[PDB]
Amino acid sequence: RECISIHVGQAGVQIGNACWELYCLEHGIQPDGQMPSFNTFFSETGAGKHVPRAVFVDLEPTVIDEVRTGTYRQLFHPEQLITGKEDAANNYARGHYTIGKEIIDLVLDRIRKLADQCTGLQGFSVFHSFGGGTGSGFTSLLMERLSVDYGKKSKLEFSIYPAPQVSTAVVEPYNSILTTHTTLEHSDCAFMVDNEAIYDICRRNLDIERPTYTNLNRLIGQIVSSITASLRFDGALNVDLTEFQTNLVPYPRGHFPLATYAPVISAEKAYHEQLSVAEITNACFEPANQMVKCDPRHGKYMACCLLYRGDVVPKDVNAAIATIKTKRTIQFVDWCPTGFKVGINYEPPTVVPGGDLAKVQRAVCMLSNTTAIAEAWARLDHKFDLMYAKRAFVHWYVGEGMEEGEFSEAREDMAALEKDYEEVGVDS
Amino acid sequence: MGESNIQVVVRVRGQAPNEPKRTAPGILTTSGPRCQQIDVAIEAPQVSSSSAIASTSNLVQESATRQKSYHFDQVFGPEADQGMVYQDVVGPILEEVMSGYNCTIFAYGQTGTGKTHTMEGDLTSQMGTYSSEAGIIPRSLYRLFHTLELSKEDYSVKATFIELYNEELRDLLSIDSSTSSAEPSSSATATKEPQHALRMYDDARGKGVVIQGLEEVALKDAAHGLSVLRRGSQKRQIAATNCNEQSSRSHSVFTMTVFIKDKGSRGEDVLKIGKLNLVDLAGSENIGRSGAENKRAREAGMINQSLLTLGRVINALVEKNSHIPYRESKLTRLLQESLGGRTKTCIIATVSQERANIEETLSTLDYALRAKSIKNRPELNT
Amino acid sequence: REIVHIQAGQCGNQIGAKFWEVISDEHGIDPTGSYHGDSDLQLERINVYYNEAAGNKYVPRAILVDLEPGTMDSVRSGPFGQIFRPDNFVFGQSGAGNNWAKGHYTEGAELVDSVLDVVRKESESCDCLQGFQLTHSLGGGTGSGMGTLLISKIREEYPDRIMNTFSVVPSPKVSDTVVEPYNATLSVHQLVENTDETYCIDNEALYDICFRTLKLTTPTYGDLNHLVSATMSGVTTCLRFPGQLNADLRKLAVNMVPFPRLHFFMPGFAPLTSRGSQQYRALTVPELTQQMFDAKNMMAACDPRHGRYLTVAAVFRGRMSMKEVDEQMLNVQNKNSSYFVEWIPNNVKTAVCDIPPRGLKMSATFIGNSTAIQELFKRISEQFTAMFRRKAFLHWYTGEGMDEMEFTEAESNMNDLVSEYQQYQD
Numbered sequence A: 001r002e003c004i005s006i007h008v009g010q011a012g013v014q015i016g017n018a019c020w021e022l023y024c025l026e027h028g029i030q031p032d033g034q035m036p037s038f039n040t041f042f043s044e045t046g047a048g049k050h051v052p053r054a055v056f057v058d059l060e061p062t063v064i065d066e067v068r069t070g071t072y073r074q075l076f077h078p079e080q081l082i083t084g085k086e087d088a089a090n091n092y093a094r095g096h097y098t099i100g101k102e103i104i105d106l107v108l109d110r111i112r113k114l115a116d117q118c119t120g121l122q123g124f125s126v127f128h129s130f131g132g133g134t135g136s137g138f139t140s141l142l143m144e145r146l147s148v149d150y151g152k153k154s155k156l157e158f159s160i161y162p163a164p165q166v167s168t169a170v171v172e173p174y175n176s177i178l179t180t181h182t183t184l185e186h187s188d189c190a191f192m193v194d195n196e197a198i199y200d201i202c203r204r205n206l207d208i209e210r211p212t213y214t215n216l217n218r219l220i221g222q223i224v225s226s227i228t229a230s231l232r233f234d235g236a237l238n239v240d241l242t243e244f245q246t247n248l249v250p251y252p253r254g255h256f257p258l259a260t261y262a263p264v265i266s267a268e269k270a271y272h273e274q275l276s277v278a279e280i281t282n283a284c285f286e287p288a289n290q291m292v293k294c295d296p297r298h299g300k301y302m303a304c305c306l307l308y309r310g311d312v313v314p315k316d317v318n319a320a321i322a323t324i325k326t327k328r329t330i331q332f333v334d335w336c337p338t339g340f341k342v343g344i345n346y347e348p349p350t351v352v353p354g355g356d357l358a359k360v361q362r363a364v365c366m367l368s369n370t371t372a373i374a375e376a377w378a379r380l381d382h383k384f385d386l387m388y389a390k391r392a393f394v395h396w397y398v399g400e401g402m403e404e405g406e407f408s409e410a411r412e413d414m415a416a417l418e419k420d421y422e423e424v425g426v427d428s
Numbered sequence B: 001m002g003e004s005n006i007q008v009v010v011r012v013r014g015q016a017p018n019e020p021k022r023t024a025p026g027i028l029t030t031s032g033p034r035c036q037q038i039d040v041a042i043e044a045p046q047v048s049s050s051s052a053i054a055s056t057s058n059l060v061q062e063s064a065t066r067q068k069s070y071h072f073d074q075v076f077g078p079e080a081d082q083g084m085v086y087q088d089v090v091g092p093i094l095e096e097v098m099s100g101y102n103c104t105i106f107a108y109g110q111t112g113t114g115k116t117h118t119m120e121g122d123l124t125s126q127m128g129t130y131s132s133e134a135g136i137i138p139r140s141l142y143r144l145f146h147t148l149e150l151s152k153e154d155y156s157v158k159a160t161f162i163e164l165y166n167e168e169l170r171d172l173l174s175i176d177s178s179t180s181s182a183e184p185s186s187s188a189t190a191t192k193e194p195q196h197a198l199r200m201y202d203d204a205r206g207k208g209v210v211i212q213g214l215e216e217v218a219l220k221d222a223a224h225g226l227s228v229l230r231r232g233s234q235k236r237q238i239a240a241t242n243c244n245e246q247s248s249r250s251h252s253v254f255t256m257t258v259f260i261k262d263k264g265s266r267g268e269d270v271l272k273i274g275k276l277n278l279v280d281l282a283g284s285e286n287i288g289r290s291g292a293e294n295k296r297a298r299e300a301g302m303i304n305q306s307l308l309t310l311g312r313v314i315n316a317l318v319e320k321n322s323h324i325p326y327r328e329s330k331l332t333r334l335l336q337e338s339l340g341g342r343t344k345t346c347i348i349a350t351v352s353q354e355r356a357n358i359e360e361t362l363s364t365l366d367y368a369l370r371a372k373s374i375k376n377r378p379e380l381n382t
Numbered sequence C: 001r002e003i004v005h006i007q008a009g010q011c012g013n014q015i016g017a018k019f020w021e022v023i024s025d026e027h028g029i030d031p032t033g034s035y036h037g038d039s040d041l042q043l044e045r046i047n048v049y050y051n052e053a054a055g056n057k058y059v060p061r062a063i064l065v066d067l068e069p070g071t072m073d074s075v076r077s078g079p080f081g082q083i084f085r086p087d088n089f090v091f092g093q094s095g096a097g098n099n100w101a102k103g104h105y106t107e108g109a110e111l112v113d114s115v116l117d118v119v120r121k122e123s124e125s126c127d128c129l130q131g132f133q134l135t136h137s138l139g140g141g142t143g144s145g146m147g148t149l150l151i152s153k154i155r156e157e158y159p160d161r162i163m164n165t166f167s168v169v170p171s172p173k174v175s176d177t178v179v180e181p182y183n184a185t186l187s188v189h190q191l192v193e194n195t196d197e198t199y200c201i202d203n204e205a206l207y208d209i210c211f212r213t214l215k216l217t218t219p220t221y222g223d224l225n226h227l228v229s230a231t232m233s234g235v236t237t238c239l240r241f242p243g244q245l246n247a248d249l250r251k252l253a254v255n256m257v258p259f260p261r262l263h264f265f266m267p268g269f270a271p272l273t274s275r276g277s278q279q280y281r282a283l284t285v286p287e288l289t290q291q292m293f294d295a296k297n298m299m300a301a302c303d304p305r306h307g308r309y310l311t312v313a314a315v316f317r318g319r320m321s322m323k324e325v326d327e328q329m330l331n332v333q334n335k336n337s338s339y340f341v342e343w344i345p346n347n348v349k350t351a352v353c354d355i356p357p358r359g360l361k362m363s364a365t366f367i368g369n370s371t372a373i374q375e376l377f378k379r380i381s382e383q384f385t386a387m388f389r390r391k392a393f394l395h396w397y398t399g400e401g402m403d404e405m406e407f408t409e410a411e412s413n414m415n416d417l418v419s420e421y422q423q424y425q426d
């Protein structure tokens, strides 16, 4: 009845640095473990000073030394702070083959001591990136090796994914194609967030033009506490992870939702505004609030999962439910009859101290599905195909033993993936 | 400017005394997905066609048709003998290079596919092997003392064996007492001699030809002491992986030179010199499958790094663009004499037959597919 | 996690002598070698350049090589000389004649093993070998000869490492010697085939930098190299210091090298403002990126706008904001969309440190790679075409014993190199 975290990559670490600040904000947890009255991410000590059920992986000693010397070093345990020697240097090859088989016997070792503490484990989630070597090749190792020993649990992926316009390194599409096909081969459910539309929230919902990577990710961090952390907490209509298994994904292999968050209001705008249940549902379908550069109007909605926070009564919801059905500009599918599975919990989202978003009465995370990401998939593929036509940037991976035929293997099957988002509105 | 472009030949694995007892009982027989044919040399592998929600690779087919039918010049199967490959590949051009034509043999494919059984091979069941049947090297060395003797002309058996272990070139025909257990001094003395010049020659007589330092020539009267080529192949570096324990680790370049002289009826001697660049390469190691390790890793990657650079050439040969970069691998500079150069050269495409190794051959199957648009111009020596 | 340093030549020994001056002040260090800095991030990753010993001491992990005695003696006679430990001055008592065909050839060969032992004094005792940094010439002999024979043996001893060097491109403007188009010329026959990367710094632009754009009168060697010295330090800040998007040197080797021969690069320092222009300039994020377009801040003597850029890396310093960092980077990709190549959509690699050096508030480090940097090569290669026909002053070197075949093939080694940028230029 618990849940485990995996943080891979320089992106994947600093994600949790907000999230575990939030997770310790869930109970007033100081750097000791001060809390009354809960066993999801935590074990209890003999003094009762709780500790996370989380795994850190960093191939450099770079990022974690901030973590294990700065603030909130003591809530983690050096059992968990698994640091490494050398980066693979943004390489799917060495991140999967060379350096990856030097730490994996130590990382899988901490699992057998933590997962065995789980009295009937619900699931566990993996954090990585696409561009980072650490988040690419180690994903190729770990997510197959977990299914050797954990073939019957849940494997969530909150994976940071590049923009088709703003990019930070050359071989970023040259990573993700090699990773994702074997990822879809093994992983259960995968989220994707684009910094493109995250920047759009900074200018239009945050209205601040000097963000940090914390401020791009406390946004991502506030999502998860409403995805999962309240599912321990008792509300009206509480959901769990296992209510996504054959629910949200209508196929064996279609598991790609889309996360949005409706109340994103800077503290100046707390008063030219009077929030409601129906307003924030109207915020749920703005194509400028997709967190990925995509328009749902070019695609459809296969499914949609409404997961709510705070003071929420469904009679106020049910009006807004048929409203969006009536005010539809969505081109809804033929195959889903009506399915809007509902999540209603009790807890307000908490205010990040020194943070950004506002003290509200009610909040929404939404999962939906679209064929619009299949465009944004292929928009990265447009960046991907032309680098192969020069056969460029190729010596780092053939020099570390990865085949050209993998690129004919992965991308053509990735194109086969992208062609299989299009089978939604075919047969009718 | 010539149109003597290329030869494209294919032999595959099969009847090797560990192989057929498990494959053909396990999966379909001699070319299961692949459909071996001999006439127009057509062949086409596939996989299972299922209504796949994630459509697998090699789903390009329809009801009762073939796809990627890469029909070639000459393909062969497990049935093709050593002499039958010599009947088509090496034999009908070995009496053509006597006039002064030049050849080069090399292979390419997935690791452990039997490149060194084609190149080197090993002998047959004889108590005394009088240059008995093996790979392509001693069979030409058996025709060496035939067609340079039955022609009854003053010949010159000239050859030199050079290994290439990870961007070097090392002689293995040497006195090589320092490589064995010898006596060095207890302390090092001063180097009174100047620097040493090796391999660093390129001429502008023609182009593509590269002159080398210290060609230790080999001269034999028969195949009696021809185990110096086996003595040289003994020092060629191998290893024991798990994808193939038998497949070699290093890679070699062995040259051939036939200086034959006869005074023709015109009143001049015919100074005809041929070349047979007997070049073997290592296996293109998939290290996650084979399980290479720390020192083995740099021993493994430079093989593929060389084969990558070998792939970096042929795409530019068929491109017809300016300044094809032959200047990364020294093997390419050994190959730039004919890769876009002048004389003859054949290409061996030995690949796998596993259903798990269909996609892994497609990078080779693309390289044999592009293996026709390389232009040359033929000549002999007088 | 550690980097080994080599210096050679009358310049590259002198050039890095200014460099360790700066890295000593990078961490608040006594001229003896005691720590007195205050930043904890100074103290945390000392290891990469230093070898801390007992008595609370610090040893610059560096080997200083010359054939002239008094040059490195002047380093020792000068300040920041006692901060070394003197078991490292590996030299000889013979002049090389400022000759590549002697320093690579004879008088280095009685000094090779004495160098490589101090390598073996260090590199085995290192925790993890990561950097082989060199600083030398291409104009003289000692910067050109001995280092090529180092790389012929160091890579032989360390195939699984990384080879960078800061080699000084000759200036057709300002020089003093004659056979200058040999020393760089025969260096290329060994620099290309055995180094993973090198840069190309030429004084021919450096005089234009300090004099014009920095409002200075007299370009001294202590000041033209102090310009190089910051651009040295900016190569590997993320490997040394914390940062948001930290980048490896090998990462910098990955994204900046499309192809294993085209690996020549160019530095750039972003707050290149004069003394007087401090109180008349506002300092921003596009202020730093503005010099990416500047021809006068490209430290090698080429028009960047002449060719087209292949690859550009940007290594930043300061508490910035990525949205401003990305979109200002985005605009430069959108402002001049003919200046790049087409098949690489993201032409830029970002790199963001968290701490800039003291005194400033923003800094950066330009690392570009374009199809016009070959302009440095056509100047040298055509000078070779005159020296060979008469075989003019060949009678210093044939008595040594280097071959015309070397003069044939290393010549054509250049044409194989240069003529590949113009494949991808136009």
Ligand SMILES: CC(=O)O[C@H]1C(=O)[C@@]2(C)[C@H]([C@H](OC(=O)c3ccccc3)[C@]3(O)C[C@H](OC(=O)[C@H](O)[C@@H](NC(=O)c4ccccc4)c4ccccc4)C(C)=C1C3(C)C)[C@]1(OC(C)=O)CO[C@@H]1C[C@@H]2O
Binding pocket: C021, C022, C025, C210, C214, C223, C226, C227, C229, C230, C231, C233, C234, C271, C272, C273, C274, C275, C278, C357, C358, C359, C360
């Ligand atoms: C009023 C004042 O103090 O001003 C600054 C200063 O304003 C300027 C003018 C400095 C100044 O530099 C020069 O005048 C200069 C002249 C020729 C060649 C190179 C530099 C400065 O010397 C440079 C020096 O910079 C630093 O200390 C940096 O940390 C720098 N350190 C050194 O170079 C250094 C070395 C030995 C001893 C002391 C400092 C650094 C930069 C990058 C990487 C590592 C270190 C400082 C504070 C200044 C002056 C004094 C004017 C500039 O240079 C640097 C490297 O910062 C010139 O372009 C910048 C613009 C700066 O704003």
Ligand SMILES: Nc1nc2c(ncn2[C@@H]2O[C@H](COP(=O)(O)OP(=O)(O)OP(=O)(O)O)[C@@H](O)[C@H]2O)c(=O)[nH]1
Binding pocket: A008, A009, A010, A011, A012, A014, A087, A088, A089, A090, A091, A129, A130, A131, A132, A133, A134, A135, A136, A160, A162, A168, A169, A172, A195, A213, A214, A216, A217, C244, C245
């Ligand atoms: N949203 C967001 N993305 C980040 C952040 N940091 C890094 N990234 C993304 O992560 C990608 C690189 O992945 P990293 O985690 O930094 O690198 P890595 O996984 O450690 O692997 P290496 O590249 O080998 O270092 C970049 O493309 C960034 O866009 C962050 O703080 N927030």
Ligand SMILES: Nc1ncnc2c1ncn2[C@@H]1O[C@H](COP(=O)(O)OP(=O)(O)NP(=O)(O)O)[C@@H](O)[C@H]1O
Binding pocket: B011, B012, B013, B014, B015, B016, B077, B078, B110, B111, B112, B113, B114, B115, B116, B117, B244, B246, B247, B248, B249, B280, B281, B282, B283, B350
């Ligand atoms: N067409 C073939 N005819 C006969 N035997 C073959 C054939 N193809 C493969 N083999 C066998 O395949 C086995 C394994 O191949 P192997 O020769 O060990 O590796 P490899 O491909 O030659 N690599 P390398 O040694 O590095 O050149 C050998 O024992 C051969 O006998």
Ligand SMILES: Nc1nc2c(ncn2[C@@H]2O[C@H](COP(=O)(O)OP(=O)(O)O)[C@@H](O)[C@H]2O)c(=O)[nH]1
Binding pocket: C008, C009, C010, C011, C012, C014, C096, C097, C098, C099, C136, C137, C138, C139, C140, C141, C142, C143, C144, C168, C169, C170, C171, C174, C175, C176, C203, C221, C222, C224, C225
């Ligand atoms: N920046 C700079 N370049 C120098 C200096 N001294 C010499 N050079 C250049 O370096 C080249 C000569 O190499 P040098 O190191 O002096 O001779 P070597 O010791 O025989 O290698 C020429 O291009 C000189 O212009 C100096 O102090 N600073």
Ligand SMILES: [Mg+2]
Binding pocket: A009, A010, A059, A087, A088, A090, A132, A133, A134, A135
């Ligand atoms: Mg990483």
Ligand SMILES: [Mg+2]
Binding pocket: B113, B114, B115, B116, B117, B118, B119
């Ligand atoms: Mg074989």
